Design a protein around this ligand. Sequence first.
Ligand SMILES: Nc1ncnc2c1ncn2[C@@H]1O[C@H](COP(=O)(O)OP(=O)(O)O)[C@@H](O)[C@H]1O
Ligand SMILES: [Mg+2]
Lengths: 99, 51, 69, 386, 50
Amino acid sequence: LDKQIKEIKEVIELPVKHPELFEALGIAQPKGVLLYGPPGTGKTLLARAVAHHTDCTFIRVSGSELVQKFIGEGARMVRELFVMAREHAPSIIFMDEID
Amino acid sequence: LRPGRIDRKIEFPPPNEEARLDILKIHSRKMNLTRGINLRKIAELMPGASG
Amino acid sequence: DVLPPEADSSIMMLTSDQKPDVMYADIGGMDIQKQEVREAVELPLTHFELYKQIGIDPPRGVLMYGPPG
Amino acid sequence: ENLEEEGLPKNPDLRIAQLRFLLSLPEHRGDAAVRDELMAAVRDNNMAPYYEALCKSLDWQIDVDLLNKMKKANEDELKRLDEELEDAEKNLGESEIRDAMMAKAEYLCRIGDKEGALTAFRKTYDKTVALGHRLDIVFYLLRIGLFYMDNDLITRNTEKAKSLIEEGGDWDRRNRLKVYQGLYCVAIRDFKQAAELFLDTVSTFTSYELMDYKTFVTYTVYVSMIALERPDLREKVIKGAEILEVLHSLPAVRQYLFSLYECRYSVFFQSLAVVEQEMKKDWLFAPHYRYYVREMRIHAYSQLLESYRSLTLGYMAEAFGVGVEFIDQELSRFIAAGRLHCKIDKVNEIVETNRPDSKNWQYQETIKKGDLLLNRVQKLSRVINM
Amino acid sequence: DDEFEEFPAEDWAGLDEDEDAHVWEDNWDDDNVEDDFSNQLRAELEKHGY
Ligand SMILES: Nc1ncnc2c1ncn2[C@@H]1O[C@H](COP(=O)(O)OP(=O)(O)O)[C@@H](O)[C@H]1O
Ligand SMILES: [Mg+2]
């Protein structure tokens, strides 16, 4: 996945480490990434690897009601996790579709 | 799928013969392997397999 | 005070009299299931060092699922 | 066919250290063949700092044109790596910055700049995120340590490597460390540990950057004959399928190994002399070539006398293909040293074997090894007070 | 500290090129002056006419 590592680096690593590159380029920093492929191909492996290498907090949002007490007692809308995401910025919010 | 929502879409195709060898090399490092294992043949023996 | 670890447990282990009378021979036609359970439960208990030498990480838990009966 | 490609990078080349060691010996100082090979490695890799040290210790004539040509390459390549490091730290990502220093550390190690490589590797280790990449840097430092026989470097990095293998269960790296550990154990006369580590990796050997497999099996046999008992030798070495396959291509080593096991003492002594000269020219076994051969002779004498209550001096001499006087001097020297449990009746030329208990041998070491401990305790209290 | 300048410090003249720099259980038997075992055996093979 050498090609995939480079692709995700310019989108998740470069905006975090070097925000000035995008400002000089005049483009908005990327914020959403989609990793698509057959199951077991390494999508979660690469997403976790980037968060580990850029020192970005890795948050996996499975929608589980077991972890809902940690997100917040409200639990009415999924954006309540942003409070924990802002506190641990830079953060990578990862969701995997079982399908 | 609307442009501007997802800034980059990255494809993860099933590993080919060479990529399977790299994955085979990575995970076999966690085992007591006899010298001379031909992991290339084992990679060839797994067509269309995932990591 | 600090009580002994084996103390203060509402759940008890199986005594000699509480051991079920079902043998492996009493079960018929589950060789695949017996092997998987044996390789993951009773073999790691007695052959933990062999697992480490080969490089296998023994499974901490086993989930047995299927239709009832 | 891809055996050598599996090994770790050959930095530093341990052949160069062996070539340097041969020139240190008075016998092979003037060997043009060894000098040409060492110079070929130096010229190819532009090892300018090694050239200065080679000519300083060995008192050689420095080729000004060759040194200047190599030094210019080193400055140009260091400048290129510095530019790459500058480029990566400003625009590229941290993994690319890490690779830039790894090339700089690798180049300094290649050109023989030991002090620069150790600093560069330490900088690379500090901001290397991957655990295996960190462990490779440790293996680089271990190879650097073995190249210069830096005991502090080897021992410190061996402990670090052991810890890294514990965190990430890399059995592949674990097998390599045993070869690295066994090589150091050979260098520090720890044949008991060298034999154990070598035999565990006789079927998992991929450390081709240190040695070739035939050489590894040759050393594995050598340390086994001095550190293993007779039952352990038969199960592991004599009946070892991996060793036996290699011994087909090494008739001398197989002759040396099987002569002692099959009690062909005249054959064994001839093979022992051959092993001596091989060990004298080996940079690892050179400090211990006298010790190993002396110990091997003790093993052969004890093995012959082990099963017999008494043997005549002539029979011992006939078995080893030597004279009676030679057996007399050798046996007397080893009995006085306390290594052979027998006594010589020179009037009748009979050697009578003894059976001293292990309690006596255990008592003396406790007196010996305990005394060594007491001096450290005695001396440590001396440092404490003032 | 009161260093012992009274006692004549014999000049070092030593080899600072890592003469031994080793840590073993070294004993006196390795230092016995004698030719190599190959020479000793080679000096005895012909002593018997072989
Ligand atoms: N390309 C790859 N290289 C090495 N290991 C892989 C690769 N792809 C998958 N794996 C292994 O598969 C396991 C689970 O894969 P995962 O990333 O969860 O699949 P998915 O991408 O479908 O989420 C991981 O522990 C990882 O070690
Ligand atoms: Mg999946």
